[PDB]
Amino acid sequence: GAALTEKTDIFESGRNGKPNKDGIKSYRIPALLKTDKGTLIAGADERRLHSSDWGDIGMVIRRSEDNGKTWGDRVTITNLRDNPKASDPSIGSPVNIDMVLVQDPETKRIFSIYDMFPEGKGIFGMSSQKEEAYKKIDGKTYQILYREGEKGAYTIRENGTVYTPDGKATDYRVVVDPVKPAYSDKGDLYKGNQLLGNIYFTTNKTSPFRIAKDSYLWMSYSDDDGKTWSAPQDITPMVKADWMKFLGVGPGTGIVLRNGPHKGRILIPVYTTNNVSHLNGSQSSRIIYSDDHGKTWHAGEAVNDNRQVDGQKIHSSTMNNRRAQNTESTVVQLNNGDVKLFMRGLTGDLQVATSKDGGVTWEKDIKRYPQVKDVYVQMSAIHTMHEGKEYIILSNAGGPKRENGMVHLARVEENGELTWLKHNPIQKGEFAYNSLQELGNGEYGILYEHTEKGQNAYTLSFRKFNWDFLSK
Numbered sequence: 001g002a003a004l005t006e007k008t009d010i011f012e013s014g015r016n017g018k019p020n021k022d023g024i025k026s027y028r029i030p031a032l033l034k035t036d037k038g039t040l041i042a043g044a045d046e047r048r049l050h051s052s053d054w055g056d057i058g059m060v061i062r063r064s065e066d067n068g069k070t071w072g073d074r075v076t077i078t079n080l081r082d083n084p085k086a087s088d089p090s091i092g093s094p095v096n097i098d099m100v101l102v103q104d105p106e107t108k109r110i111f112s113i114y115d116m117f118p119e120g121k122g123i124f125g126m127s128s129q130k131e132e133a134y135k136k137i138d139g140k141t142y143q144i145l146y147r148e149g150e151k152g153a154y155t156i157r158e159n160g161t162v163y164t165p166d167g168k169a170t171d172y173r174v175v176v177d178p179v180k181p182a183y184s185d186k187g188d189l190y191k192g193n194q195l196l197g198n199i200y201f202t203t204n205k206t207s208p209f210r211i212a213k214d215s216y217l218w219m220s221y222s223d224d225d226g227k228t229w230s231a232p233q234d235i236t237p238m239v240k241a242d243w244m245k246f247l248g249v250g251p252g253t254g255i256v257l258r259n260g261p262h263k264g265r266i267l268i269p270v271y272t273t274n275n276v277s278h279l280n281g282s283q284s285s286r287i288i289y290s291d292d293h294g295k296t297w298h299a300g301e302a303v304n305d306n307r308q309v310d311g312q313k314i315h316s317s318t319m320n321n322r323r324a325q326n327t328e329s330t331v332v333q334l335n336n337g338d339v340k341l342f343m344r345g346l347t348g349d350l351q352v353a354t355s356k357d358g359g360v361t362w363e364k365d366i367k368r369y370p371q372v373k374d375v376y377v378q379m380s381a382i383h384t385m386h387e388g389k390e391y392i393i394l395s396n397a398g399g400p401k402r403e404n405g406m407v408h409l410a411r412v413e414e415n416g417e418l419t420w421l422k423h424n425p426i427q428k429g430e431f432a433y434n435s436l437q438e439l440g441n442g443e444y445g446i447l448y449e450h451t452e453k454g455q456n457a458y459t460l461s462f463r464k465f466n467w468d469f470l471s472k
């Protein structure tokens with residue numbers, strides 16, 4: 001009655017600290033998406049040198065047209081070239097990290113949203129002081145460029161031409177429309193046809209220009225079921241406020257609202273930090289959305305904005321409360337229009353926020369569910385129906401550490417509350433960061449990180465199971 005398949009390594013990592021046959025050491029941060037054509041897209045972070053949250057990392061995906069039985073070749077969405085002059089090769093490359101997948105059910109366009117950092121240690125190597133990244137000139141927005149020795153703000157305008165702080169064009173230009181595989185030529189700084197450097201390089205630079213050391217949010221899309229992908233789109237300035245230090249997505253799979261006055265809206269989990277307590281107490285979860293099928297993006301209010309904690313109000317931009325944080329999350333919409341946000345936190349159990357206006361604002365009280373343990377690791381949840389009954393599946397590590405992956409089943413009551421029914425294990429051993437997707441015909445897929453036999457950091461594996469496996 002109940003069946004669960006053996007694990008299928010989609011992105012097989014190296015061993016005992018060595019690279020695999022392809023020269024890749026580690027894989028991390030999975031994302032699973034079932035497309036309109038029934039295809040399964042497995043995304044991940046290709047860490048070519050080590051497992052840490054920085055370095056030469058590429059955004060790759062694999063496709064399956066047989067519900068996960070077989071998988072095609074690796075398809076790279078983005079892979080910025082590393083700095084050939086960096087002193088420490090482990091931290092001498094622009095970074096891309098933490099992918100989120102989602103498809104618009106009207107246009108059939110598939111989106112991929114991920115973080116982007118210039119050369120350095122990613123989120124752990126952020127310049128303490130702020131550097132304005134964009135400038136608004138007569139309506140249009142341009143990315144700022146800083147010149148060595150100078151204080152003014154150059155800008156990247158039409159055709160990638162660099163403009164002086166006084167608004168006059170220069171002989172320098174940026175590669176704004178890359179053409180190389182994986183778009184590895186993005187940010188290349190030219191002076192005519194002579195390549196000088198890259199605006200994303202921060203050390204031992206060969207060119208005089210660079211962008212701000214900040215957190216950026218990029219987006220690539222595919223109009224052919226994930227076969228080919230667009231060049232990266234910089235959506236940072238559409239959603240990132242000036243007070244935000246870090247702005248990154250909660251890895252996994254987004255959703256499209258299927259009912260209510262905001263049907264068609266796309267939701268992408270993200271979380272931020274302020275300049276008050278950076279990652280010590282400002283980690284706040286929020287959501288961005290697009291009401292025009294991915295053309296423009298907008299930022300909702302954070303769950304922590306105007307939240308009452310221990311008799312005091314707080315805001316994501318000013319808080320310094322370790323335990324009140326909420327990071328990487330996963331979003332789900334109920335049949336009653338409400339939106340639930342399952343957030344990674346530090347309370348030891350599951351925290352859930354609710355929204356009645358499409359994820360823009362959140363309710364007063366954050367619900368906690370001790371039945372589901374949260375060991376402070378990523379999680380993914382999806383909505384599913386069965387014989388006219390509303391359910392929600394959520395998966396995450398069961399404990400004691402990032403171990404023993406679990407699959408929790410909950411009933412969506414008429415009032416909007418959740419009743420947790422069963423908790424079945426899906427993988428013994430190491431288990432961190434997973435992504436759920438419904439496959440149809442009562443079948444469900446899951447992509448998750450796991451190691452065994454001395455495998456490096458995480459190998460991402462895939463499994464299927466049915467409703468009978470879910471109901472104890």
Ligand SMILES: CC(=O)N[C@H]1[C@H]([C@H](O)[C@H](O)CO)OC(C(=O)O)=C[C@@H]1O
Pocket residue numbers: 029053097098115122123248279283327328377
């Ligand atoms: C952008 C980034 O670095 N994301 C990382 C995330 C982050 O460090 C933490 O959420 C800070 O709060 O956590 C971890 C982790 O293994 O726990 C992995 C992610 O790759």
